Every structure is written in C-alpha cells, then in structure tokens.
C-alpha cells in the first residue's frame, strides 16, 4: 500500500502560493507540516509538491486534507488514463504533460494530479519542470482576472496552460512533418523510414492521451457539481473546444504521416532491376571476349598461329564487332 510507481526520484520541492485581491505571498518550502493549515483560509491557495516519490508527504497531505487513500494511490500511480473523480469535498483529476526534443525524436509524458478543496488546489508533480509558468506570472504581476476569483479559476488556468503546451507540441510536430515530408520526397533512406515510424508511434500515443483529456473536460463543463460553481463553466467549455482542435489536428497529422511512405515502400525491386541492367550488360558484353581470348590462348603450338594476317589487329577488330553487336541487340527494349 502507498507505493511509488514512477521512475522520477531525483529531487523534492514544495512551491506554495497565496494570492488575494490586494495581498499576495509565495514561498517555497521543504517541510510538509508548514503548508498544512492553508485549507481553512478563504484566500485561494495553490499547493505544489514537485516530487511525489516521497510517499510520506503525499500520505500526510492526504490524511490532513481528508482524501481517501484510493485517490492517494491513484496519485502515486503513473500508468493511468487521464480521468476525473467527483466527491463531496474534493474533485480529483489526472492529466499528463508532454515534452519533445528537436534533436532526437522522442516524446516523454508525466502525470499531474489536481485536487480542489474549498479555496485550495493541490497539484502533485513527478519532477522539476512544468508548463504553468504563465499562471505564475499572472499571479505575480497584477494581470488578468486570476486574483479576483476562487480556486476553480486556478484549476481552469492550470488546465488552460496544459492545453496551450499541447498546442506548442503540435507546432513542433508540424515542423517535423514538413521537414520529413520534404526528405521523403527527395531523400528516401532507412533513417527516413525509422523517423517516419517514430513519428507514427508518437502521434498515436498523443491521440491515446488526447481522448481521455476531452472526456475529462466534457465532464467538467457538463456535470457542474456545486464545488466548481457555474460561473467558470464557459471557460471549461472553451478548453473543451481547444481539446477538439487538438484531436482534429492529430487526426490529420496521423493521416499525412501514415500515407507518406506507401509510394517509397512499393517502389522497391525497381532498383533491383537497375542492378540487373548493369550486371547483365557487363556480363553479356565481356564474357564472350575473354572466352575467345582463352580459345585463342590455347598453348600447344599446332594452331594456325603463325604470322599470317596480323593476328592482334584482327582479334581487336572482332572484339569491336562483337561489342557493337551486343550493344545493338541491347536497348531494343530500352535497356541501360
């Protein structure tokens, strides 16, 4: 019970904010007991535990905030579909961030669990590095309407930042698709085939992540439980439509990438025919000549091998004659 499944155990950090209409405070700490009593303040809070490998902190915050151990082991689990759970006191959501490297084409995922309780949002993360910086700047620089609303708007802002990162990853994949399409158009090779297959698998993984995300946002803007408040529903509808955009784009990208490679795959053994052309033309032209060179190379001295007519020029003349006949016979059916 209460076992960590992920592979991220590098570092631990807590990053807590507290913002109101006129008063704002943000501090990073390392003791779980320090950030405990924030549930009771009417001021909206944002508790962020960056390392979930330490099961003690997760268990402590779960027991203090009174969330069932089932959602705690859901938080610990990483191989989980994105989902949302509704209860009487808290709503538990699971998302997945993504990261792409332009140098080497691989896609990495990382689960983030979101819990809303009164004017507090709890965010559990596996490692240092997130996509929620715009919300932090909006908190710290007196902009937007983030500090005039409750923790439900904070939940919105976090999810909106996540879908924005999805759009950014889509842009990177767009560039990759354009480059790879040009390459396959003019530079077909094994490395291109491997890169195309990697792009295919990355896209199908993205789509498999995309569907549960759309389900979660649909349940968010349609179920409207009393803890979310009806004021923020249109915002969740907006990000639902953004997820629709993401799904449509990944559909189109999958179609393009899957269809790229068909002509190249089917256009093989036509090169084998060219190797046939070359190998056969040299063989056919040059075997008979060495053959009759060996025929006249018989060494027993009893041939009509005297000076007679000039043997070497006559042999070279018939060399040229045979070669010309061989060339003439070829290209009749468009060889070479």
């Amino acid at each position, epitope marked *: 019970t209460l076992v960590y499944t992920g592979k991220y155990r590098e570092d631990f950090e807590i990053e807590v904010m507290n913002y109101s209409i006129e008063e704002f405070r943000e501090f990073k700490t390392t003791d779980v007991e320090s950030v405990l009593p924030f549930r009771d303040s009417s001021t909206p809070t944002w508790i962020n535990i960056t390392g979930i490998h330490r099961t003690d902190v997760v268990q402590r915050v779960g027991e203090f905030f009174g969330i069932h151990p089932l959602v705690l082991e859901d938080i610990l689990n990483v191989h989980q579909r994105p989902k949302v759970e509704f209860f009487e006191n808290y709503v538990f959501i699971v998302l997945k961030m993504f990261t792409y490297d332009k140098n080497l084409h691989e896609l990495e995922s990382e689960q983030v669990s979101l819990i809303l309780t009164k004017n507090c949002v709890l965010m559990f993360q596996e490692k240092i590095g997130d996509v929620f910086d715009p919300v932090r700047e909006r908190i710290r620089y007196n902009r937007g309407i983030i500090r005039k609303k409750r923790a439900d708007y904070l939940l919105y802002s976090l999810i909106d930042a996540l879908v924005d990162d999805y759009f950014v990853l889509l842009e990177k994949i767009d*560039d990759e698709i354009d480059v790879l399409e040009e390459e396959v158009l003019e530079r077909p090779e094994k490395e291109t085939v491997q890169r195309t297959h990697q792009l295919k698998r990355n896209l199908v993984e993205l789509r498999k992540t995309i569907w549960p995300l759309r389900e979660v946002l649909s349940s968010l803007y349609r179920d409207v439980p009393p803890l979310i408040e009806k004021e923020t529903v249109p915002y969740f509808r907006d990000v639902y439509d953004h997820t629709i955009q993401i799904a449509d784009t990944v559909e189109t990208f999958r179609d393009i990438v899957s269809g790229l490679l068909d002509v190249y795959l089917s256009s093989v053994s036509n090169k084998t025919n060219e190797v046939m052309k070359v190998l056969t033309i040299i063989a056919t032209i040059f075997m008979p000549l060495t053959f009759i060179a060996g025929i006249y190379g018989m060494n027993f001295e009893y041939m009509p091998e005297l000076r007679w007519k000039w043997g070497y020029p006559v042999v070279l003349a018939v060399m040229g004659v045979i070669a010309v006949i061989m060339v003439v016979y070829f290209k009749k059916k468009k060889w070479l």
Partner: antibody, heavy 123, light 106 residues
Framework: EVQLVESGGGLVQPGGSLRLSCAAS????????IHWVRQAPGKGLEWVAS????????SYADSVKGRFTISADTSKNTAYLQMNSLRAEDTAVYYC???????????????????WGQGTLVT | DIQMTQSPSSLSASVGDRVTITCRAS??????VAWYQQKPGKAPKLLIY???SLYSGVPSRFSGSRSGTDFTLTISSLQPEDFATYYC?????????FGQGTKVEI
C-alpha cells in the same frame, strides 16, 4: 471599392497625445480586423496594433503597449488609434490595413493584410 | 516574441533573371507567413499568404515555399515593375512581426 482613409496625422510635441482615425468604405469593420502598421522614415514595416470590432479584442506591440489604445466605431465604421506619451522614436508613417483569417491546420490560423490606406505622417 | 531574419538585405539583378529571398524564423511559425511588395512612397501590396498561396490578382511570376522554418520567395522572371522592397511577416501569434526588408535593384 474597398477603401481605407486615415486622418489625424501631423506634428505633435514630445510627451503629447494624438488620435488617428481610419475611415472604412466598401466593407463593415464589424466583420474584419483592422491593423495599424508603422514605418519609420527610412526603415522597415512595424506592426503596432489590431482590433476586432465585433469581439472588441485588442493586441498591441511591445513598443506601444500601455501607451497606445486602439478602438473602432461600428456606427461610424471607423477605427481609432489613441497615441499617448509620444516620443521622438515614434515618428513614422502610420498605415491602416484590413485583414482576413485563413486556415492552415485545425490548430493554426493566420491572417493577411489585403487593403492598405495611403498612410499618415506623425512626428 | 518571434524574430524573423530576412536575408539578403539587398539584391541586384536584371530583368528576366531568377531572384530568391529567404526568411528564417526564430522558432516555430506554422505556415502563417506572408510576403509584401512596397514600392517607394506607397502602401505595401500583398503577394503571397500561407507561405505558398498567391493572392488574387498577383502575376504567377512570384512563388513561395516553406521547408521547415525558413521561407523563400522566388520570382521566376523579373520585370521592370518588380524592383521594390519585399517584406516577411508571421501571423502565428497575436503579436505580428515583420522582416527588415529586401530591396531588389538594378
């Protein structure tokens, strides 16, 4: 038929305020987005601000953000550019342009400026 | 913010030649790149949008292309009317950014 005519240019003392107006004919500003593009004397084009009249949503360049203020009048079918805290670096030719959205993918969009006004001079 | 470097800053060629202007984006702009021609003392004129699509009324001499992040504008055969300043624009973000400009001169 589509025409954009600017007005409100001229010399202004540094640290003063000016108001540019852009009369639109042949189309309704409520259906298109209106841009202001700035060209310094002997320098390249620079985007300033954009307005979507129906939505009311604005976007300002980093250079003029906080100072400038774009607006449009649906009744007058004109767009306005309030310029405040003008500096010697803001002297340029100011253009008024009409753009349409087009489509690349389901997630990406762009816009292209078809019709431009003749421009105004502000110093 | 998007930075677009439109090089070369100047071009010299005669009528009937083939001239190309490239344009590099700082980071990912999907395809929302447009080209404008501004003869001196006049307003810019739209030539190409979506990095490859001719605007209506533009002669087929101009063409555009994209290979990843760099965008090229090419004229098949120049004309006396084609000597002007050409600009590079991105519309991927709400903050539009232009290129510094390339002048085609004899």
């Amino acid at each position: 038929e589509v025409q954009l005519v600017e007005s409100g240019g001229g010399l202004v003392q540094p640290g003063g305020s000016l108001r540019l107006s852009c009369a639109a004919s042949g189309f309704n500003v409520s259906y298109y987005s209106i841009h202001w593009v700035r060209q310094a004397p002997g320098k390249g084009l620079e985007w300033v601000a954009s307005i979507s009249s129906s939505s009311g949503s604005t976007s300002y360049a980093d250079s003029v953000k906080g100072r400038f203020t774009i607006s449009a009048d649906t009744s007058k079918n004109t767009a306005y550019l309030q310029m405040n805290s003008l500096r010697a670096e803001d002297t340029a030719v100011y253009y008024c342009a009409r753009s349409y959205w087009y489509y690349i993918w389901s997630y990406s969009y762009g816009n292209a400026m078809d019709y431009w006004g003749q421009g105004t001079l502000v110093t | 913010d998007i930075q677009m470097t439109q090089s070369p800053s100047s071009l010299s060629a005669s009528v009937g030649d083939r001239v190309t202007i490239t344009c590099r984006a700082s980071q990912s702009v999907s395809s929302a790149v447009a080209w404008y021609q501004q003869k001196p003392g006049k307003a810019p004129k739209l030539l190409i949008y979506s990095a490859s699509s001719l605007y209506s009324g533009v002669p087929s001499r101009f063409s555009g292309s994209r290979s990843g992040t760099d965008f090229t504008l090419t004229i098949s055969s120049l004309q006396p009317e084609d000597f002007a300043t050409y600009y590079c624009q991105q519309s991927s973000s709400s903050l539009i950014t232009f290129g510094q400009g390339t002048k085609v001169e004899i």
